[PDB]
Amino acid sequence: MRECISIHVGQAGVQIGNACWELYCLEHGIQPDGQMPSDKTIGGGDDSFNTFFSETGAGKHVPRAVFVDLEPTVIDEVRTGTYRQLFHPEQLITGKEDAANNYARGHYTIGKEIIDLVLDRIRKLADQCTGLQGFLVFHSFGGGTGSGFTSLLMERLSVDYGKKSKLEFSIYPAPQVSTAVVEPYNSILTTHTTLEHSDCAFMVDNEAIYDICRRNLDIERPTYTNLNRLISQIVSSITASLRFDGALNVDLTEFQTNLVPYPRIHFPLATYAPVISAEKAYHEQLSVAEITNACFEPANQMVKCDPRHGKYMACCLLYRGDVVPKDVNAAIATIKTKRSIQFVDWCPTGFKVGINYQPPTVVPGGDLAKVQRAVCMLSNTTAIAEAWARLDHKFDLMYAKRAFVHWYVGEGMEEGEFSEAREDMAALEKDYEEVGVDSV
Amino acid sequence: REIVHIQAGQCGNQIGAKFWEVISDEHGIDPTGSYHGDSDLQLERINVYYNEATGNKYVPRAILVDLEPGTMDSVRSGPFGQIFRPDNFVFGQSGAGNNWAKGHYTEGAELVDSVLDVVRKESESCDCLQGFQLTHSLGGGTGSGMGTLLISKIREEYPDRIMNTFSVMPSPKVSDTVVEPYNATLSVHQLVENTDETYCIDNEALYDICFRTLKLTTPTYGDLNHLVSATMSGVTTCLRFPGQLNADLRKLAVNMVPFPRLHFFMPGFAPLTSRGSQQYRALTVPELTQQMFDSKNMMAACDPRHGRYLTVAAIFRGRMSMKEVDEQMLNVQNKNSSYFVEWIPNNVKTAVCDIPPRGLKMSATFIGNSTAIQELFKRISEQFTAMFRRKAFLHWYTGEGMDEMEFTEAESNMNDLVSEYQQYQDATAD
Amino acid sequence: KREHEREVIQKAIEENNNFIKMAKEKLAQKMESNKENREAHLAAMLERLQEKDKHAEEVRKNKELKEEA
Numbered sequence: 054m055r056e057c058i059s060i061h062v063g064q065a066g067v068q069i070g071n072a073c074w075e076l077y078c079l080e081h082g083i084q085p086d087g088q089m090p091s092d093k094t095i096g097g098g099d100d101s102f103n104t105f106f107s108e109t110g111a112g113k114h115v116p117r118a119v120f121v122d123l124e125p126t127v128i129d130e131v132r133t134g135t136y137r138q139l140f141h142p143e144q145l146i147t148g149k150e151d152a153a154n155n156y157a158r159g160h161y162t163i164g165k166e167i168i169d170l171v172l173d174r175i176r177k178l179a180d181q182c183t184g185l186q187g188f189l190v191f192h193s194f195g196g197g198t199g200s201g202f203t204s205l206l207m208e209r210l211s212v213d214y215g216k217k218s219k220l221e222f223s224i225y226p227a228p229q230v231s232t233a234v235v236e237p238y239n240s241i242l243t244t245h246t247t248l249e250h251s252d253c254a255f256m257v258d259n260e261a262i263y264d265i266c267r268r269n270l271d272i273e274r275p276t277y278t279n280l281n282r283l284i285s286q287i288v289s290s291i292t293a294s295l296r297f298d299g300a301l302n303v304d305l306t307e308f309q310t311n312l313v314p315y316p317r318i319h320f321p322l323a324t325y326a327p328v329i330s331a332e333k334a335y336h337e338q339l340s341v342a343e344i345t346n347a348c349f350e351p352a353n354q355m356v357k358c359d360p361r362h363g364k365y366m367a368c369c370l371l372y373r374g375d376v377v378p379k380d381v382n383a384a385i386a387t388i389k390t391k392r393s394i395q396f397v398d399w400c401p402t403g404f405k406v407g408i409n410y411q412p413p414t415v416v417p418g419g420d421l422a423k424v425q426r427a428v429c430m431l432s433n434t435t436a437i438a439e440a441w442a443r444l445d446h447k448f449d450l451m452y453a454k455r456a457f458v459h460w461y462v463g464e465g466m467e468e469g470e471f472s473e474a475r476e477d478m479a480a481l482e483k484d485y486e487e488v489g490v491d492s493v
Numbered sequence: 494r495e496i497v498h499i500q501a502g503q504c505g506n507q508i509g510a511k512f513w514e515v516i517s518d519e520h521g522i523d524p525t526g527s528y529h530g531d532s533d534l535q536l537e538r539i540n541v542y543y544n545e546a547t548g549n550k551y552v553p554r555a556i557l558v559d560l561e562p563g564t565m566d567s568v569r570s571g572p573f574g575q576i577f578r579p580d581n582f583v584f585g586q587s588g589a590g591n592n593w594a595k596g597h598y599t600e601g602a603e604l605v606d607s608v609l610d611v612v613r614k615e616s617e618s619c620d621c622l623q624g625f626q627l628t629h630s631l632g633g634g635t636g637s638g639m640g641t642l643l644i645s646k647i648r649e650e651y652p653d654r655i656m657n658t659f660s661v662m663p664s665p666k667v668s669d670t671v672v673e674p675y676n677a678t679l680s681v682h683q684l685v686e687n688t689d690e691t692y693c694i695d696n697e698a699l700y701d702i703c704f705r706t707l708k709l710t711t712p713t714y715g716d717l718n719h720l721v722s723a724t725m726s727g728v729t730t731c732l733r734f735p736g737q738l739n740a741d742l743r744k745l746a747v748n749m750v751p752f753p754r755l756h757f758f759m760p761g762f763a764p765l766t767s768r769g770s771q772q773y774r775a776l777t778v779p780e781l782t783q784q785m786f787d788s789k790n791m792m793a794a795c796d797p798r799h800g801r802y803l804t805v806a807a808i809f810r811g812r813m814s815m816k817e818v819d820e821q822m823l824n825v826q827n828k829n830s831s832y833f834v835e836w837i838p839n840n841v842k843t844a845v846c847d848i849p850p851r852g853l854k855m856s857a858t859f860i861g862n863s864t865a866i867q868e869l870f871k872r873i874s875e876q877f878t879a880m881f882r883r884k885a886f887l888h889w890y891t892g893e894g895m896d897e898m899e900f901t902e903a904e905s906n907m908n909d910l911v912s913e914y915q916q917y918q919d920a921t922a923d
Numbered sequence: 924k925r926e927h928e929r930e931v932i933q934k935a936i937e938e939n940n941n942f943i944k945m946a947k948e949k950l951a952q953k954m955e956s957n958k959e960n961r962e963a964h965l966a967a968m969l970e971r972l973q974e975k976d977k978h979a980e981e982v983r984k985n986k987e988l989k990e991e992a
């Protein structure tokens with residue numbers, strides 16, 4: 054029980070899903086044809102990985118996942134790739150014409166022609182669950198499909214599953230790899246439309262990831278392949294609580310309680326350590342102390358911002374591999390003193406800590422060194438508002454002149470939807486300001 | 494995705510024929526239409542410009558139109574004249590005599606239905622049509638007058654598809670027909686309202702490139718058209734080979750056109766050298782970048798230093814270092830920050846394709862949306878007003894039924910277009 | 924205490940129903956407005972193109988009138 058359904062939307066959502074499911078298979082020992090020689094219960098079972106894999110009578114372990122895109126070329130690569138035998142053809146849904154980087158086409162003109170079919174495939178997956186926990190939705194902010202169609206899907210999921218929880222994994226745009234000049238528009242529109250339908254969203258800043266790959270992995274010009282492989286390690290760390298079980302393993306829902314103090318404030322900042330190449334790790338055994346310390350370096354954040362200039366409302370450390378409580382205690386004790394970690398005065402307990410004993414794994418031919426221990430930190434800091442500020446400024450510059458707006462209006466949108474989306478962003482920036490203010 | 498290609502009039506069919514030549518070799522198609530290439534990358538997107546017929550034969554999705562039988566006979570005889578579908582030749586008899594009114598209203602109107610039947614036939618067979626591309630000149634009669642009439646009729650039947658033109662502006666340095674400013678203005682008035690993207694291919698700049706840069710004493714139409722084919726192959730690279738940026742006509746439009754009327758692009762190609770200078774100058778990414786943004790390399794007679802870029806697309810082709818490209822493009826933006834509008838962040842996009850054009854190790858193509866284009870329109874307006882001031886030749890036009898103020902309508906509209914560019918060139922972010 | 928326990932459970936049910944109801948209605952009304960707005964943008968553009976076809980035919984009639992002199 055406690056099953057989770059994954060929904061991968063648009064190019065970024067699809068390609069990141071491919072990276073994730075390959076990593077999951079390696080972690081659980083599932084083969085590219087779905088066989089899992091380790092699994093003794095055939096046809097079913099209530100094991101931990103069953104939260105993400107269903108089983109067929111023949112012993113196939115099938116991702117509880119839907120890939121959807123408005124054009125075919127990206128999902129076509131899944132249909133013909135190493136793990137093509139892993140998915141049933143109906144879990145891969147493609148259109149003929151994409152959103153053209155236009156939220157309006159994704160939410161309306163094109164999306165409305167495939168939404169019912171997508172919601173149908175999802176129902177079929179939900180019907181195979183005994184205790185469906187919720188959804189994980191992977192998408193870009195900038196794409197026409199990642200923004201517009203993802204919004205439509207989320208609104209539809211609220212209608213069909215009520216309060217059932219929906220978590221987002223979102224790619225925040227960066228000029229170093231951005232495919233469209235209008236991505237700030239699509240970003241604000243999808244964030245406005247989705248804010249009240251999402252329980253918790255993990256933002257990944259492409260520029261942050263881009264820089265980490267360049268600096269820590271020694272890749273001069275990172276590609277999506279480099280970025281997604283790193284992203285997948287963060288995703289694996291967050292879901293590892295659900296796919297494995299350990300005496301010190303703590304569930305992601307217990308983290309969510311600590312991470313979301315108010316409905317709208319549901320955007321944790323992620324970090325991950327160690328990020329190091331085989332060459333550098335050859336002569337360097339990284340201790341719990343070193344990787345814990347790295348979580349508080351501004352340059353290791355998955356979104357570009359400065360948490361020293363903000364206040365923490367929560368820190369959750371998800372350790373995995375060779376880690377024992379004594380070492381964690383000493384590590385945090387050190388960090389508390391040598392660092393300037395400021396918590397709001399309304400949060401009595403700021404740290405939550407768990408250990409998953411499953412060691413980190415890496416895909417052969419990847420860029421990450423294989424390490425004995427790793428840590429992922431999810432924190433809720435007001436500093437993440439800096440990312441909203443930067444987006445909103447790019448929006449305002451273009452919108453003041455109505456640049457490109459005719460593309461959205463021509464597709465059926467009104468200007469009011471723009472300024473409504475922008476005003477919502479203004480309130481969000483203010484909300485992050487007020488939670489940080491000391492109590493009277 | 495599929496694109497339907499239409500080419501009208503002398504110029505349109507000349508540069509169109511060259512376009513099919515150049516890209517057919519890039520993809521490995523001989524004049525018989527058989528595939529003879531060596532990499533699966535050539536066939537990935539082959540269906541954008543080619544239908545597949547029984548026997549693995551690839552036929553251009555191209556329609557050939559002209560009021561004059563002459564020019565299409567010769568296209569049939571030129572290289573690759575046999576790879577075109579025969580029923581897709583739609584030709585008249587009278588000819589247009591460089592008379593815009595004949596192409597748009599009388600002679601061209603009688604033949605437009607025949608073209609529409611072929612366009613429906615071709616769009617019928619498309620899995621998911623993306624839109625149309627048209628080659629023509631603005632100075633003649635058929636490509637000009639009947640060219641814009643086709644766009645009008647096609648837009649009626651396919652209102653939600655992309656309309657893309659390659660428009661050759663007149664220049665007295667290359668033609669001596671004195672009414673070309675009339676014909677260009679009457680059609681610039683149609684393009685400003687009925688196309689989504691227009692590449693402005695200016696015979697003035699083409700000639701200047703051959704004289705000053707290429708050191709060609711007396712350039713010919715063969716020369717001018719080699720620059721065009723090189724350019725057209727460049728601006729369609731990202732549509733014909735697997736990529737991510739500007740992968741289709743609509744994504745290109747959404748990235749290049751911030752306001753509906755300002756959809757006139759100025760292209761540029763590089764490298765460009767004279768025979769003597771090619772030996773003592775190795776082509777590098779810094780050399781390609783500098784040339785790309787130099788006014789000497791613009792396919793439209795405009796100095797970008799006289800206006801400001803709203804949007805820019807840059808396509809590099811060849812084996813090079815992605816990192817070098819990223820650095821070279823940031824540096825040029827840095828040094829020339831004053832020439833990019835600040836109210837459109839990150840308005841320069843760059844693509845890299847692995848396969849080079851044939852004959853070069855490296856090439857770079859430039860697609861600029863710049864307020865400096867207004868210099869091109871100001872030039873035509875200047876010649877239009879000189880002619881119209883003394884009402885030279887209108888009885889040829891009014892004799893087909895046209896009204897006088899229809900001329901002043903076009904001129905006035907083109908004037909508003911110039912002011913529009915000035916309005917956004919002078920706008921600031923504060 | 925028992926009246927209050929039912930009160931609370933029924934309020935939880937009502938807030939979830941109202942959440943579904945508003946999402947349902949907001950979505951419905953947005954699909955509706957977009958349909959109208961996009962169809963009107965196309966009608967406008969097509970109405971304009973035909974107004975040009977009208978002028979062309981008038982340009983043809985005009986040619987014959989001068990043609991009888």
Ligand SMILES: COc1cc2cc(c1Cl)N(C)C(=O)C[C@H](OC(=O)C(C)C)[C@]1(C)O[C@H]1[C@H](C)[C@H]1C[C@](O)(NC(=O)O1)[C@@H](OC)/C=C\C=C(/C)C2
Nearest residue numbers: 588589590591592593595669670671672673885886889890
């Ligand atoms: C005043 O001395 C001149 C006397 C003539 C031509 C010119 C001059 Cl300047 N030229 C060159 C021009 O001014 C440009 C252009 O000339 C031509 O197109 C022509 C060279 C083919 C034209 C007359 O202004 C064009 C009209 C719209 C006219 C052109 C046409 O009569 N047909 C038509 O419908 O309209 C055309 O048909 C092919 C016949 C030929 C006329 C000729 C040769 C006389």
Ligand SMILES: C/C(=C/c1csc(C)n1)[C@@H]1C[C@H]2O[C@H]2CCC[C@@H](C)[C@H](O)[C@@H](C)C(=O)C(C)(C)[C@@H](O)CC(=O)O1
Nearest residue numbers: 707715716719720723764765766767768771776852853
């Ligand atoms: C083939 C070339 C090679 C080159 C190698 S190094 C460098 C700076 N240029 C370039 C580019 C060609 O795409 C063509 C655009 C220019 C038109 C010429 C083909 C032109 O028509 C022709 C008559 C010439 O001037 C040359 C043959 C000298 C041509 O090589 C010049 C040129 O820039 O071609």
Ligand SMILES: Nc1nc2c(ncn2[C@@H]2O[C@H](COP(=O)(O)OP(=O)(O)OP(=O)(O)O)[C@@H](O)[C@H]2O)c(=O)[nH]1
Nearest residue numbers: 063064065068151152153154193196197198199230
């Ligand atoms: N990290 C990461 N970002 C990606 C990837 N693919 C695209 N992006 C980013 O996502 C944005 C573009 O959105 P896409 O996901 O490509 O678009 P889409 O959802 O397919 O939308 P349309 O194609 O317009 O219908 C840009 O900011 C890209 O840099 C990927 O594999 N990884």
Ligand SMILES: Nc1nc2c(ncn2[C@@H]2O[C@H](COP(=O)(O)OP(=O)(O)O)[C@@H](O)[C@H]2O)c(=O)[nH]1
Nearest residue numbers: 502503504507630632633634635636663668717
């Ligand atoms: N660059 C270029 N311009 C051309 C070519 N042929 C004609 N033109 C130009 O096109 C204009 C006349 O249009 P043309 O195609 O001859 O007339 P049409 O047949 O009535 O469309 C003049 O400005 C010519 O210089 C050509 O092959 N290349």
Ligand SMILES: [Ca+2]
Nearest residue numbers: 094095097098
């Ligand atoms: Ca089992």
Ligand SMILES: [Mg+2]
Nearest residue numbers: 063064151198
């Ligand atoms: Mg896409």
Ligand SMILES: [Mg+2]
Nearest residue numbers: 503504591633
């Ligand atoms: Mg001619």
